[PDB]
Amino acid sequence: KCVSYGVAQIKAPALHSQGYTGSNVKVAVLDSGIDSSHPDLNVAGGASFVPSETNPFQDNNSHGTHVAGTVLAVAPSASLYAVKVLGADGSGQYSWVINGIEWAIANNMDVINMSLGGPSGSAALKAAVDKAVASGVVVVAAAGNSGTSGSSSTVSYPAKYPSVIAVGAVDSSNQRAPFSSVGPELDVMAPGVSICSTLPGGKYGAHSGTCPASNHVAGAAALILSKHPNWTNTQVRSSLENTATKLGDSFYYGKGLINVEAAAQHH
Ligand SMILES: [Cl-]
Ligand code: NA
Ligand code: NA
């Protein structure tokens, strides 16, 4: 298949070898669904809020299935939930996403991954992610793939909301990917170039984006909570941000590349 490096790059193998693989951590993938038929994917539960696509365990896009593979690669023992808020074409309404956030809160998810976003949000979308973080959920989002706009932030919503961890993409050499959105909202980087993960119908394929980068961070959160089940979302986020491997300027790199090994020992 594609060969990939991302799991090693964030130093997840260190935690796996100590017995920390994300067991009893609930991770909600708010995406195009998850193909649970994939032999490498073990999905704990699901809900679809896409009214024309009723099966959250069928992914007609393939984006949600790629997210799942990357999260389970980082946190093999995580309980993954398929929250379908995006259709086949990869687009959804903000009300579908809000319904998936509400579902994640109600069902005691530890982590939300939103591998999505647009250039504008809404009060109702901000209320939803703010409410999830108030409830103690770790919320992670792709920073966006809008490159640079001189002085302007190009970070998408929901990542642009202070409550949400905003993740940009680096390559295997820790260089910012030219597509990775920029701005003071940027928190951390993770592997986002040619990420090999699961695709529907038992396949594998590489994808580049801030979405695969956010998937590494959602996984890292689950590893941390499988060592520190007592930690608040506040402590989880602070551990990832404060032990990041410093790279370039924060506008481009935030705090740098997540190091889940370091994060799992933060004091
Ligand atoms: Cl369907
Ligand atoms: Na399966
Ligand atoms: Na944010």
Q: Could you give the topology of this structure?
A:
Blueprint: H1 6-9, H2 12-16, E1 26-31, E2 43-48, H3 63-74, E3 79-84, H4 94-106, E4 111-114, H5 123-134, E5 138-142, E6 165-170, E7 188-191, E8 195-199, E9 203-207, H6 210-227, H7 233-242, H8 250-253, H9 260-263
Parallel strand pairs: 1-3, 1-4, 2-3, 4-5, 5-6, 6-7
Antiparallel strand pairs: 8-9
Bound molecules: chloride ion (CL) and sodium ion (NA) (2 copies).
Characterize the structure shown.
The PDB classes it as ligase. Keywords: subtilisin, peptide ligase, ligase. It forms a monomeric assembly. The entry is titled "Crystal structure of Omniligase mutant W189F". The protein is Subtilisin BPN'. This protein has 267 residues and is an alpha/beta fold. The chain has one domain: 3-Layer(aba) Sandwich (Rossmann fold), CATH 3.40.50.200. 31% of the residues lie in helices and 18% in strands. It contains 9 helices and 9 strands. Strands 2-3-1-4-5-6-7 form a 7-stranded parallel β-sheet, sandwiched between helices. It has a two-stranded antiparallel ribbon with strand order 8-9. Helix 3 links the parallel strand 2 (43-48) and strand 3 (79-84). Helix 3 (63-74) packs parallel to helix 6 (210-227) and helix 4 (94-106) packs parallel to helix 5. The radius of gyration is 16 Å and the shape is globular. 58% of the residues are buried. It binds chloride ion and sodium ion (NA) (2 copies). One sodium ion (NA) is lined by residues 159-162, 164, 166, 185.
Compact overview of the structure:
The chain has 267 residues and is of the alpha/beta class. It has 9 helices and 9 strands.
